[PDB]
């Protein structure tokens, strides 16, 4: 879905949306995402990157390029090998071979729950495919095609959903608005969002170039 996201971003950016801007008319409540990353912890110098999704499921992308996901029921597990092969297990019944990884996941889970703010908390299955950080942002690519970009300095966030051709923007006051990209082309948007969308295009290009 990355190339579709790139085309959607090309189209909106080429329309020069910030140049009468009628940004409010580009909002679409029907396009609100189901999943996004609400918390994350970068322990990649030792273990990997842990994260919580907005449904309270947690996942780790380990340094050996495997993934373990704990469902929000707190017992059901999905393990994804490097090849991409999925296995389904539980904490109550797992092979000894995954003990190390499960214990690491539980520690990440407990820490995030206790210590980090839940992004998009005021709003009512995929795993982390890859991620990277720049000086400005962390970029999270989910297995359902969604791409999330969290900007460090001002705490603003984009969630890009190529299947809906939509983008959710969480601003500095933590207001959460979801826009149809084609409506941003039609009605325009503020310079702030337009700038973030230009950055997003460059980030999606990075994902595509490092496949």
């Amino acid at each position: 879905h990355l190339s579709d996201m790139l085309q959607q971003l090309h189209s909106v950016n080429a329309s020069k949306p910030s140049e009468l801007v009628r940004q409010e008319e580009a909002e679409d409540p029907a396009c609100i995402p189901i999943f996004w990353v609400s918390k994350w912890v970068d322990y990649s110098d030792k273990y990997g990157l842990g994260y919580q999704l907005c449904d309270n499921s947690v996942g780790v992308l380990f340094n050996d390029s495997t993934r373990l996901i704990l469902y929000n029921d707190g017992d059901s597990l999905q393990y994804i090998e490097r090849d991409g092969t999925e296995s389904y297990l539980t904490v109550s019944s797992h092979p000894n071979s995954l003990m190390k990884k499960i214990t690491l996941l539980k520690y990440f889970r407990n820490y995030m729950s206790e210590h980090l703010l839940k992004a998009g908390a005021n709003i009512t299955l995929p795993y982390l495919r890859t991620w990277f950080r720049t000086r400005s942002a962390i970029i999270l690519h989910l297995s359902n095609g969604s791409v999330q970009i969290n900007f460090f300095q001002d705490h603003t966030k984009l969630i890009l959903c190529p299947l809906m051709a939509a983008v959710t923007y969480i601003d500095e006051k933590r207001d959460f608005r979801t826009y149809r990209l084609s409506l941003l082309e039609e009605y325009g948007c503020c310079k702030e969002l337009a700038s973030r969308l230009r950055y997003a295009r460059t980030m999606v290009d990075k994902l595509l170039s490092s496949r």
Binding site: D42, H115, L116
Partner: peptide
């Protein structure tokens, strides 16, 4: 590093 505290 961590997400927002």
């Amino acid at each position: 590093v961590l997400s927002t505290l």
